[PDB]
A paper describes a structure:
Fragaceatoxin C (FraC)11 is a potent haemolysin of the family of actinoporins, defined as a group of ~20 kDa protein toxins produced by sea anemones. Actinoporins are classified as α-helical PFT (α-PFT) because the transmembrane pore is predicted to form an α-helical barrel. The lytic activity of actinoporins on biological membranes is enhanced by the lipid sphingomyelin (SM) and by lipid-phase coexistence. Here we reveal structures of FraC corresponding to four different stages of its activation route, namely the water-soluble form, the lipid-bound form, an assembly intermediate and the transmembrane pore.
To examine the lipid-bound conformation, we determined three independent crystal structures of FraC in complex with the water-soluble lipid 1,2-dihexanoyl-sn-glycero-3-phosphocholine (DHPC) at resolutions ranging from 1.6 to 2.3 Å. Remarkably, up to four lipid molecules are bound to a single protein chain. The molecules of DHPC bound to each molecule of FraC lie on a common plane, resembling the surface of a membrane. Although multiple molecules of DHPC bind to FraC, the toxin remains monomeric and its overall structure is virtually unchanged with respect to that of the water-soluble form (rmsd=0.37±0.10 Å). The examination of the structure in three different crystal forms reveals two well-conserved lipid-binding pockets, suggesting they are the primary sites during the initial adhesion of FraC to membranes. These two pockets overlap with those of lipids L2 and L3 seen in the structure of the transmembrane pore, and establish comparable non-covalent interactions with the lipids. In contrast, no evidence of the L1 lipid is found because the protein remains monomeric and, therefore, lacks a second protein chain contributing half of the binding site of L1. FraC–lipid interactions occur mainly at the headgroup region of the lipids. Because the headgroups of SM and DHPC are identical, that is, phosphorylcholine (POC), the crystal structures explain the targeting of actinoporins towards synthetic membranes containing these two types of lipids.
Residue numbers in the entry: 3 to 179
The structure:
Amino acid sequence: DVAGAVIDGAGLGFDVLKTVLEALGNVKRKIAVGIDNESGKTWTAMNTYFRSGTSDIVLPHKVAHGKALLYNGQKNRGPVATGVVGVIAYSMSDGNTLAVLFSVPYDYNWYSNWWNVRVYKGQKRADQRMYEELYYHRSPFRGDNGWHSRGLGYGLKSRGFMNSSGHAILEIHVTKA
Ligand SMILES: CCCCCC(=O)OC[C@H](COP(=O)(O)OCC[N+](C)(C)C)OC(=O)CCCCC
Ligand SMILES: CCCCCC(=O)OC[C@H](COP(=O)(O)OCC[N+](C)(C)C)OC(=O)CCCCC
Ligand SMILES: CCCCCC(=O)OC[C@H](COP(=O)(O)OCC[N+](C)(C)C)OC(=O)CCCCC
Ligand SMILES: CCCCCC(=O)OC[C@H](COP(=O)(O)OCC[N+](C)(C)C)OC(=O)CCCCC
Ligand SMILES: CCCCCC(=O)OC[C@H](COP(=O)(O)OCC[N+](C)(C)C)OC(=O)CCCCC
Ligand SMILES: C[N+](C)(C)CCOP(=O)(O)O
Ligand SMILES: C[N+](C)(C)CCOP(=O)(O)O
């Protein structure tokens, strides 16, 4: 149950993500991400685009149906007042891209936690424009300590949870609609 591994999908829960979050170190802003693939498709990691922050974890490369991936990120390790903000992109085996936004800001006087999950047509690496789409234009969810669900199209739906603090957990399930 470490960042960079896959686990059985039915084992994903808050306690796994707490474990990942604590293993990372006590840095001011950090995130543990788990995504359960119950999509019927095999996922292959492309990349993570960091608008803010970094990770030392390799995205789990192959995520079969029935598996969840574990991942983490953290703020820049230097003295800069920035958070951990980015997009994960996986290529799904029927030809499209699963994109996951996380935003864990440095300053909660001006910003809040957000996430999003969307399917893009074709095979699309995460980048600044994708980040701007998911953050500004494609109706992200609040990291509000509540669950949110939405249809993705493509025969898929998502349900996920993000907490509100700078030590963030993000749990997402992708299932067949
Ligand atoms: C584009 C490089 C120039 C520096 C701006 C930048 O990267 O954002 C830095 C900072 C860090 O943002 P961060 O906490 O990492 O992420 C939350 C903000 N978003 C999600 C928009 C990036 O956010 C700000 O713009 C500070 C200005 C405060 C105006 C109220
Ligand atoms: C385009 C930059 C200025 C307006 C952007 C914006 O939507 O501000 C978000 C602000 C709230 O930003 P938020 O992260 O909730 O709070 C900033 C933190 N405070 C409230 C302490 C300033 O408005 C709302 O209350 C509802 C918006 C939610 C969906 C668009
Ligand atoms: C009513 C369903 C919207 C989501 C499911 C879907 O059919 O997604 C297809 C596509 C997946 O996104 P993408 O691959 O980026 O294609 C839409 C953008 N264009 C038309 C430029 C290629 O999104 C759309 O065409 C409309 C939603 C995008 C507007 C926010
Ligand atoms: C008087 C300039 C105020 C700048 C607004 C700000 O605080 O940051 C918003 C933006 C948020 O970054 P991002 O979410 O990446 O969106 C960048 C591109 N836009 C704004 C078009 C979506 O960061 C910037 O690129 C402005 C940097 C000006 C620094 C002198
Ligand atoms: C006076 C109301 C507008 C400014 C305050 C606000 O709405 O919170 C906006 C924003 C929080 O914006 P953002 O994270 O872009 O919006 C959250 C909603 N989403 C995630 C959908 C974009 O923080 C800022 O950059 C303030 C800059 C002051 C210039 C007057
Ligand atoms: C951009 N960087 C990651 C190389 C340096 C720090 O940038 P930021 O964290 O101040 O945006
Ligand atoms: C508030 N904002 C200017 C940073 C977001 C709007 O930018 P844009 O994505 O419409 O170019």
